[PDB]
Amino acid sequence: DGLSNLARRLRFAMKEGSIWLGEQRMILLHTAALGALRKELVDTLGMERARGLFMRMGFHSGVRDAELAKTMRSGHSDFGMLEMGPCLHTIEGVVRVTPLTVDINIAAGVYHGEFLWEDSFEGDVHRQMFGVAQAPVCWMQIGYATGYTSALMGKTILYRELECVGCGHPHCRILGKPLEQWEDGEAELALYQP
Amino acid sequence: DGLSNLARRLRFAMKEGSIWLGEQRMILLHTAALGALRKELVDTLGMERARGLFMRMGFHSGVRDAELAKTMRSGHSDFGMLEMGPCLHTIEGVVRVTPLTVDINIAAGVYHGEFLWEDSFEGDVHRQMFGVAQAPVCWMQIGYATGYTSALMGKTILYRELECVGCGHPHCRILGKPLEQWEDGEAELALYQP
Numbered sequence A, B: 001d002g003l004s005n006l007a008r009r010l011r012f013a014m015k016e017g018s019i020w021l022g023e024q025r026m027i028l029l030h031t032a033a034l035g036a037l038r039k040e041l042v043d044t045l046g047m048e049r050a051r052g053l054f055m056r057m058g059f060h061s062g063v064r065d066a067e068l069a070k071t072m073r074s075g076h077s078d079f080g081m082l083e084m085g086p087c088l089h090t091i092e093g094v095v096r097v098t099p100l101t102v103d104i105n106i107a108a109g110v111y112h113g114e115f116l117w118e119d120s121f122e123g124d125v126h127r128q129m130f131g132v133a134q135a136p137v138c139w140m141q142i143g144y145a146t147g148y149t150s151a152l153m154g155k156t157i158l159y160r161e162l163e164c165v166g167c168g169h170p171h172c173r174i175l176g177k178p179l180e181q182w183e184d185g186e187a188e189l190a191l192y193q194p
């Protein structure tokens, strides 16, 4: 439903050699190509520095998709507004999202969201070049959620992966909530600065 | 155009959150998101380190798409083979290509090709993050042509931008030819090494 609706805002304009999602120009990019960039970045700047670059890239994508969802706001509930995010992420072929428990009220600054991630392109791309890892590896995907939800709520909303396919788990699972409700929220917020 | 022929190799499966072009998984990525990453890489590693990283990412994309083109060899001419490169580059929303002159024989190792680039995503976004540039800026786009053509020929075909919108130019213009037919071809080839 949310997919069908938002999918109509994705258009291919070959006569411009361009692709548009709402107001934003998009490119189709091979995950292998992004994966080899990630490898170079990790290999030369280190896992931590690379994680941040990607999280902030994901952050701007999410902010942009939130602007797009903001225009499509009429008739939609707060949850329906939130749902567009997972939907765009899915349309963009990034990940398949299933909302598990979602508590939102934008007026009241209420947000607590848990989501299932399946077929995370990031997790199964890190795998093909690093194998399994200690910490969660879907950095760009997390930044997108963070970006999208913070833009929607008009306040800092951070996300963490509780489990991730690149750690060896069967799925990625994420939790989003306001900066105040994270035990190390200040360290988390830092990663989103250049 | 044969954009039609290749269009059938692009399959969107939203009900799964994935996009495949031939046998490569793809994502739709906001050019503004790539722009932000590009900005951080320049500021942190310099113009030339970054240019290298993008050329190499583009190179990987090109090599993968030439693999797709090869499965569609059918009863195509060498030029018709060559032509799927520009077609894929246009399907992926990167740029629209116009051949000026194309001289190719894969068997004999001959290649000399000049093209127009219109509506370059990469030139357009570089200007938005840095302004007009001193030298051509469609790094990822050049690497793709290089990678695609080199993989198709089984020999190193390097491309250079003679003109670029990122420079104040009303369009981009490129020249591709074998390594040995460039005077500086050994220092150009260096950028394709991590």
Ligand SMILES: Cc1ccc(O)cc1C
Pocket: A082, A085, A086, A087, A089, A095, A097, A113, A115, A141, A144, A145, A148, A149, A176
């Ligand atoms: C809000 C949002 C957007 C995209 C996702 O993958 C997940 C979430 C939670």
Ligand SMILES: Cc1ccc(O)cc1C
Pocket: B082, B085, B086, B089, B095, B097, B113, B115, B144, B145, B148, B149, B176
């Ligand atoms: C070969 C090839 C591939 C992609 C382009 O944009 C241009 C050329 C010439």
Ligand SMILES: [Zn+2]
Pocket: A117, A120, A123, A136, A137, A138, A161, A163, A164, A165, A166, A171, A172, A173
């Ligand atoms: Zn993950």
Ligand SMILES: [Zn+2]
Pocket: B117, B120, B123, B136, B137, B138, B161, B163, B164, B165, B166, B171, B172, B173
């Ligand atoms: Zn250019």
